[PDB]
Amino acid sequence: TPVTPYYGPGHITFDWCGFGDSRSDCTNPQSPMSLDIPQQLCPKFSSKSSSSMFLSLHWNNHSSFVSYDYFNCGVEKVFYEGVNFSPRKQYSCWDEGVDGWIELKTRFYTKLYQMATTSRCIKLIQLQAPSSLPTLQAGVCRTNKQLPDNPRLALLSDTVPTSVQFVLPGSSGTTICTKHLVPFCYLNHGCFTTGGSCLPFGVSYVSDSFYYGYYDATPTESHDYVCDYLFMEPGTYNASTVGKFLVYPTKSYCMDTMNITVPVQAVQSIWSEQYASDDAIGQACKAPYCIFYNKTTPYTVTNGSDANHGDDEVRMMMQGLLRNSSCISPQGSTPLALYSTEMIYEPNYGSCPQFYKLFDTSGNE
Amino acid sequence: TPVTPYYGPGHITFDWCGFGDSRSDCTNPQSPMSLDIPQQLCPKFSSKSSSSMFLSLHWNNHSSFVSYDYFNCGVEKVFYEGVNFSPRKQYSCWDEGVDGWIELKTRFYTKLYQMATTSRCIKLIQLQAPSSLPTLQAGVCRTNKQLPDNPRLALLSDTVPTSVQFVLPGSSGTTICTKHLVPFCYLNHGCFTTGGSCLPFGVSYVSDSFYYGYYDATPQIGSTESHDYVCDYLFMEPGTYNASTVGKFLVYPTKSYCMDTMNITVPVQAVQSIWSEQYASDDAIGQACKAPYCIFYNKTTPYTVTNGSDANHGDDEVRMMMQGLLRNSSCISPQGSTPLALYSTEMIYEPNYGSCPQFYKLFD
Ligand SMILES: *[C@@H]1O[C@H](CO)[C@@H](O[C@@H]2O[C@H](CO)[C@@H](O[C@@H]3O[C@H](CO)[C@@H](O)[C@H](O)[C@@H]3O)[C@H](O)[C@H]2NC(C)=O)[C@H](O)[C@H]1NC(C)=O
Ligand SMILES: *[C@@H]1O[C@H](CO)[C@@H](O[C@@H]2O[C@H](CO)[C@@H](O[C@@H]3O[C@H](CO)[C@@H](O)[C@H](O)[C@@H]3O)[C@H](O)[C@H]2NC(C)=O)[C@H](O)[C@H]1NC(C)=O
Ligand SMILES: *[C@@H]1O[C@H](CO)[C@@H](O[C@@H]2O[C@H](CO)[C@@H](O)[C@H](O)[C@H]2NC(C)=O)[C@H](O)[C@H]1NC(C)=O
Ligand SMILES: *[C@@H]1O[C@H](CO)[C@@H](O[C@@H]2O[C@H](CO)[C@@H](O)[C@H](O)[C@H]2NC(C)=O)[C@H](O)[C@H]1NC(C)=O
Ligand SMILES: *[C@@H]1O[C@H](CO)[C@@H](O[C@@H]2O[C@H](CO)[C@@H](O)[C@H](O)[C@H]2NC(C)=O)[C@H](O)[C@H]1NC(C)=O
Ligand SMILES: *[C@@H]1O[C@H](CO)[C@@H](O)[C@H](O)[C@H]1NC(C)=O
Ligand SMILES: *[C@@H]1O[C@H](CO)[C@@H](O)[C@H](O)[C@H]1NC(C)=O
Ligand SMILES: *[C@@H]1O[C@H](CO)[C@@H](O)[C@H](O)[C@H]1NC(C)=O
């Protein structure tokens, strides 16, 4: 019989998982009023109030940073977080401004979703400190906001070219790490004046089979904190420097491999209209790796815990996760059928119905 | 009644193109005996006997390098080339060995296929020589084989930092370049001894809105100095950029693949491109052509000629696959193409596009 896509995420198999924030955290004291998902799906989500996967990559816990050890496994994946690092927060570190950090956010989610499509498990781990570390002075932000804890940015007591060794583990607990999502960051725009001269800023991650680096010795002194998010295989690497500045990772997303490529799903994660949101999720979640379900309405709560918890639109969307589905698409989900009442676009997966009008024998069409 | 996918590449509309080599080059004097495609599809292909897209990016014409100004447009795209840069050629430049270049080949096709999925036109273009070049001495391979023409590797007379400007144009003829595939290459593994000392190897492409670079001054141990010629294949927007160096060594690009933009993403199709088993082939095409961006049609038989021009032209299996391009299909998949149908005799896997029949057993 004919079917119509149900707008919202969905799952075809039992092997699915969710990543989220307060709006899918049943440990929140206001739950179930504070949920945007059905309460019975809380055990399917790895979620924590006030956190995000981006924020938790870069920061451990501080007064304005709620860091969570995100961890979940599923062939099919539903992401519903991101809001807790938004322009509302007004975070910046050096001269990059808030827009700089919305760009970094977009880069991170782009890579996260990409890597997630060939993984089943995704787990944020704390890396061990390099075994040998010289005397180090912690870096700071020009803004006096909290410097990211990952990657570590620190200052050596001399200008001697140096390497320390870091380990991306092959496993963490029961999870296999066939790959790691690792940030590589640096301060750009020329040499950096400290310890009596304008020192080249040159750092790199290196092994026999890997190189990624930045170098600038070129002559207001301005710098931006910039990051790239790297696919790195398990192994031991050098965090190398041409001198003074040292950057090495302290956390990573450990992922395993599955031998199928399944697009992930992300729902728009924003604040009510009185606060400043971004579209990093929409810009990051693109074909062919990610199926983006945008909101068509503002974040609007009529029967929830406060103005930013219990959106009617997203609640209706998340009902899709309770449905019988064999096809997942940006139009939503359908059970197994021959014909769809509307056109189904990409990315999609499963066994999908074909657009009804293509088979019409009227022929009015 | 369920339909069976026809194994081989295909197309849903007229707006498709091919990229190829001798096996789809009707100008070859042995044509059509030397073709693996139907003769009547030669006009849909941009192809040159003895060339490949990877080779042509890095080299112009030299004794054993046939370079071709590849150029074609299509929403759908069939790639059947690659073999003319394989281990049979025994090419290497620095200490990276033959396998080092098979790796670079793989990186290039991977990037090519990815970028191609959101482009219609792909055009290999020559870049303008930078203005006000300093005095430069040509680089050389340690193997004394032919140094890539692209990017240019050259030696300045001094060791002080400097920069030259290169332009990636916004258009070439009537093709719009919304982006460029540009190689960035360097000699790795520590400082490089020239001019009587071991100098840092530090090069970069930089603009107000772009940075990619490499730097190493690690001292060498004993007499073990070794370097590999390494490349990364970069997505770069049209604009002016600096090719910068910390001194001595200069790297700047001299060619790129100019591509435009279409607002749908469509996977490309690659057919396995190999030699007869008299010669060494590689699997760079198969390793580069991956879901979700490329649909790989591998060969299940060796390259096997029964009615062609020589052992390496007229493979029966690929000839059968290329018959698929003679229909307008509705569904394109790794199992091959189908017309519009309710049911398929077998599971249709990813990547696929169009309107695809469903495996009949699902409905009983
Ligand atoms: C950042 O700090 C918070 C605390 O402010 C850490 O959250 C805490 O995590 C622990 C262990 O994961 C939770 O304890 C557990 O609670 C359950 C009940 O659900 C209990 O049965 C377990 O045996 C255990 O005690 C704790 O509830 C949780 N607290 C809060 C307020 O969330 C968080 O782990 C820290 N993040 C990082 C990256 O270290
Ligand atoms: C490298 O050297 C070869 C010569 O050995 C160059 O091949 C020549 O390229 C031109 C332009 O692609 C060919 O002309 C074309 O002929 C066809 C068919 O007649 C015509 O329909 C096209 O419009 C075009 O005029 C020419 O035939 C071809 N010559 C040979 C002997 O194959 C090649 O271009 C050089 N490569 C580079 C990068 O300069
Ligand atoms: C997700 O939906 C939002 C809201 O419709 C889109 O944001 C709008 O974008 C248009 C086009 O620039 C603006 O004129 C509107 O004012 C935006 N509205 C708001 C409230 O910001 C957003 O572009 C969508 N994202 C994607 C990837 O489709
Ligand atoms: C999920 O939905 C599919 C499609 O509606 C169900 O499959 C149908 O089940 C009925 C029995 O109620 C059969 O008569 C039909 O032939 C089935 N249709 C197809 C296309 O297979 C399926 O039973 C549902 N699954 C669950 C667990 O409810
Ligand atoms: C495409 O097909 C060829 C031939 O089957 C595959 O190459 C074989 O790969 C197996 C597994 O590694 C090796 O044991 C054989 O020695 C290879 N045979 C030949 C003739 O090369 C190749 O792996 C395939 N590529 C992909 C991406 O599927
Ligand atoms: C790090 O650098 C040292 C010395 O430069 C080198 O010998 C060592 O192998 C490197 N370690 C790794 C894991 O690449
Ligand atoms: C509001 O939500 C509560 C608790 O989640 C529920 O019991 C109640 O029926 C809802 N009221 C309306 C009007 O939907
Ligand atoms: C396919 O359709 C196009 C577009 O209308 C048509 O012009 C062309 O003749 C057809 N090509 C083939 C190979 O049937």
Put simply, the answer to whether B355 touches A358 (Cβ < 8 Å) is: yes
Q: Cα(A160)–Cα(A138) distance, rounded to whole angstroms?
A: 17
Q: Cα(B356)–Cα(B9) distance, rounded to whole angstroms?
A: 15
What's the angle, vertex CA B92, arms to CA B88 and CA B94, rounded to 5?
A: 165
Q: Which of B11, B189, B227, B313 is catalytic?
A: B313
Strands B45-47 and B16-20: parallel
Ligand 6 centroid from CA B113, angstroms: 34
- Residue nearest atom 26 in ligand 5 by C-alpha distance: B286
Whether A87 and A105 have beta carbons less than 8 Å apart is answered as no
Closest CB from A215, A347, A355 relative to B355: A355
Q: Is B69 close to ligand 2, i.e. is its CB under 6 Å away?
A: yes
Residue matched to tokens 């991101």: A82
A361 Cβ contact partners less than 8 Å away, ≥ 6 residues apart: none
Q: Which of B22, B49, B256, B344 is catalytic?
A: B22
Task: Give me the DSSP letters along B269-317.
Answer: EEE-----TTS----HHHHHS-TTTEEEE--SS---EEEEEETTEEEHH
Q: Cα(B45)–Cα(B9) distance, rounded to whole angstroms?
A: 13
Could you tell me which chain B residue has the CA closest to the CA of A214? B213
Q: Cα(A116)–Cα(A258) distance, rounded to whole angstroms?
A: 10
- Residue nearest atom 21 in ligand 4 by C-alpha distance: B363
Residue matched to tokens 């294949």: B233
Q: Is A330 close to ligand 3, i.e. is its CB under 6 Å away?
A: no
Q: Cα(B23)–Cα(B34) distance, rounded to whole angstroms?
A: 6
Closest CA–CA distance from residue A300 to any residue of chain B (Å):
32
Q: Is A50 close to ligand 1, i.e. is its CB under 6 Å away?
A: no
Residue A22 annotated to the active site: yes
3-state SS string for B263-280: CCCCCEEEECCCCCCCCC
Reference B327, options B11, B7, B6, B2; nearest CA is B11
Q: Which residues of chain A have a CB within 8 Å of the CB of B213? A: 213-215
State which ligand 3 atom lies nearest to the alpha carbon of A285.
27
The ligand placed nearest to the CA atom of residue A324 is: 4
Whether B236 and B182 have beta carbons less than 8 Å apart is answered as yes
The ligand placed nearest to the CA atom of residue A291 is: 3
Q: Is the dihedral of CA A299, A302, A303, A304 positive or negative?
A: positive
Closest CA–CA distance from residue B355 to any residue of chain A (Å):
6
Beta-bridge mates of residue A72? A122
Give the H/E segment covering residue B53: helix B53-58
Tell me the Cα Rg of chain B: 22
Residue matched to tokens 């996260």: A112
Q: Cα(B258)–Cα(B327) distance, rounded to whole angstroms?
A: 30
The ligand placed nearest to the CA atom of residue B13 is: 8
Q: Resolution for this model in angstroms, one decimal place? A: 2.0
Q: Cα(B254)–Cα(B241) distance, rounded to whole angstroms?
A: 13
Reference A57, options A72, A73, A70; nearest CA is A70
Expressed in percent and rounded to 5, the helix, strand and coil fractions of chain B are: 15, 35, 50
Q: Which of A21, A22, A25, A58 is catalytic?
A: A22
What's the angle, vertex CA B312, arms to CA B310 and CA B316, rounded to 5?
A: 95
The first and second tokens of residue B48, run together, are 């040159």
The first and second tokens of residue A62, run together, are 């501080």
Whether A329 and A7 have beta carbons less than 8 Å apart is answered as no
Reference B209, options B245, B181, B176, B236; nearest CA is B236
State which ligand 1 atom lies nearest to the alpha carbon of A27.
19
Q: Which residues of chain B have a CB within 8 Å of the CB of A218? A: 161
Which burial class, exposed, middle or buried, applies to A121 when counting CB atoms under 10 A from its CB (0-12, 13-18, 19+)? Answer: buried
Q: Cα(B184)–Cα(B180) distance, rounded to whole angstroms?
A: 12
Q: What is the dihedral of CA A127, A128, A134, A136, to 10 degrees?
A: 50
Q: Could you tell me if residue B202 is left (phi over 0), alpha (psi between -120 and 50 degrees) or otherwise beta? A: beta
Q: Cα(A224)–Cα(A131) distance, rounded to whole angstroms?
A: 30
Q: Cα(B111)–Cα(B57) distance, rounded to whole angstroms?
A: 13
The first and second tokens of residue B295, run together, are 């649909």
Q: Is B61 close to ligand 2, i.e. is its CB under 6 Å away?
A: yes
Backbone angles phi, psi at B54, to 5 degrees: -65, -50
DSSP state of B190: S
CA atoms within 13 A on the CB side of A8: 18
Beta-bridge mates of residue A239? A164, A205
3-state SS string for A153-189: EEEECCCCCEEEEEEECCEECCEECCEEEEEEEEECC
User: Is omega for the bond preceding A330 within 30 degrees of 0, making it cis?
Assistant: no
Q: What separation in angstroms does the CA of B3 have from each of B14, B325, B342? A: 22, 17, 8
Query: Which of A216, A228, A329, A357 would you mutate first to test chain B, the one with the most B CBs within 10 A?
Result: A216
Q: Which residues of chain A have a CB within 8 Å of the CB of B293? A: 288
A350 Cβ contact partners less than 8 Å away, ≥ 6 residues apart: A12, A325, A326, A327, A328
Reference B74, options B33, B22, B14, B142; nearest CA is B14
Whether A107 and A75 have beta carbons less than 8 Å apart is answered as no
Q: For chain B, give every domain's residue range.
A: 15-327
Closest CB from B188, B213, B292 relative to A288: B292
Q: Cα(B299)–Cα(B7) distance, rounded to whole angstroms?
A: 10
**Helix residue ranges, H only, chain A:** 53-58, 97-116, 280-284, 312-318
Reference B348, options A58, A348, A127, A209; nearest CA is A348
- Residue nearest atom 16 in ligand 1 by C-alpha distance: A27
Q: Cα(B5)–Cα(B360) distance, rounded to whole angstroms?
A: 13
Residue B313 annotated to the active site: yes
- Neighbouring CB atoms inside 10 A of B80's CB total 26
Whether B261 and B179 have beta carbons less than 8 Å apart is answered as yes
Residues of A in CB contact (< 8 Å) with B are 117, 161, 188, 202, 204, 211, 213-215, 217-218, 242, 261, 263, 286-289, 326, 336, 338, 346-347, 349, 351-355, 358-359
Q: Cα(A203)–Cα(A245) distance, rounded to whole angstroms?
A: 7
DSSP state of A117: T
Whether B243 and B251 have beta carbons less than 8 Å apart is answered as yes
Q: What separation in angstroms does the CA of B37 have from each of A236, B4, B48, B78, B308? A: 48, 22, 14, 11, 12
Q: Cα(A297)–Cα(A286) distance, rounded to whole angstroms?
A: 21
Whether A178 and A189 have beta carbons less than 8 Å apart is answered as no
Put simply, the answer to whether A338 touches B363 (Cβ < 8 Å) is: yes
Query: Which of B110, B214, B358, B364 would you mutate first to test chain A, the one with the most A CBs within 10 A?
Result: B358
Q: Is the dihedral of CA A140, A142, A146, A148 positive or negative?
A: negative
Q: Cα(B125)–Cα(B205) distance, rounded to whole angstroms?
A: 19
Q: Cα(B6)–Cα(B21) distance, rounded to whole angstroms?
A: 24
Whether B175 and B258 have beta carbons less than 8 Å apart is answered as yes
Q: Which residues in chain A have their C atom more than 2.5 Å from the N of the next written residue, marking a break after them?
A: 219
Whether A174 and A256 have beta carbons less than 8 Å apart is answered as no
Query: Which of A1, A189, A354, A361 would you mutate first to test chain B, the one with the most B CBs within 10 A?
Result: A354
State which ligand 4 atom lies nearest to the alpha carbon of A337.
20
Reference B233, options B207, B205, B209; nearest CA is B205
Reference B277, options B312, B310, B250, B248; nearest CA is B312
Q: Cα(A288)–Cα(B118) distance, rounded to whole angstroms?
A: 11
Q: Could you tell me if residue A305 is left (phi over 0), alpha (psi between -120 and 50 degrees) or otherwise beta? A: alpha
Amino acid at B21: D
The ligand placed nearest to the CA atom of residue B255 is: 2
Put simply, the answer to whether B217 touches A161 (Cβ < 8 Å) is: yes
Experimental method used, please? X-ray
Put simply, the answer to whether B265 touches A288 (Cβ < 8 Å) is: yes
Residue B189 annotated to the active site: no
Contacts 24+ apart (CB under 8 A), A306-310: A306/A30, A306/A34, A307/A272, A307/A274, A308/A271, A308/A272, A308/A275, A309/A22, A309/A23, A309/A30, A309/A33, A309/A34, A309/A35, A309/A36, A310/A33, A310/A34, A310/A35, A310/A36
- Neighbouring CB atoms inside 10 A of B61's CB total 11
Q: Cα(B52)–Cα(B88) distance, rounded to whole angstroms?
A: 14
Closest CA–CA distance from residue A35 to any residue of chain B (Å):
34
Give the H/E segment covering residue B320: helix B316-322
Put simply, the answer to whether B356 touches A354 (Cβ < 8 Å) is: yes
Whether A186 and A247 have beta carbons less than 8 Å apart is answered as yes
Residues of B in CB contact (< 8 Å) with A are 117, 161, 188, 202, 204, 211, 213-215, 217-218, 230, 246, 265, 267, 291-293, 340, 342, 350-351, 353, 355-359, 362-363
B17 Cβ contact partners less than 8 Å away, ≥ 6 residues apart: B44, B45, B46, B72, B73, B74, B76, B77, B78
Identify the three-state secondary structure at position A76. strand
Whether A131 and A238 have beta carbons less than 8 Å apart is answered as no
Q: Determine the length of chain B.
A: 364
B206 Cβ contact partners less than 8 Å away, ≥ 6 residues apart: B212, B213, B241, B242, B244
Residue matched to tokens 């064999």: A326
What's the angle, vertex CA B232, arms to CA B228 and CA B236, rounded to 5?
A: 150
Q: Is A162 close to ligand 6, i.e. is its CB under 6 Å away?
A: no
Q: Which residues of chain B have a CB within 8 Å of the CB of A161? A: 217-218
DSSP state of B332: E
- Neighbouring CB atoms inside 10 A of A235's CB total 15
Whether A18 and A314 have beta carbons less than 8 Å apart is answered as no
Which burial class, exposed, middle or buried, applies to B196 when counting CB atoms under 10 A from its CB (0-12, 13-18, 19+)? Answer: exposed
Closest CA–CA distance from residue A43 to any residue of chain B (Å):
30
Q: What separation in angstroms does the CA of B28 have from each of A111, B68, B315, B342? A: 45, 14, 16, 42
DSSP state of B84: T
Q: Cα(B132)–Cα(B142) distance, rounded to whole angstroms?
A: 29
Q: Which residues of chain B have a CB within 8 Å of the CB of A289? A: 292
Put simply, the answer to whether B358 touches A346 (Cβ < 8 Å) is: no
Reference A66, options A81, A44, A45; nearest CA is A81
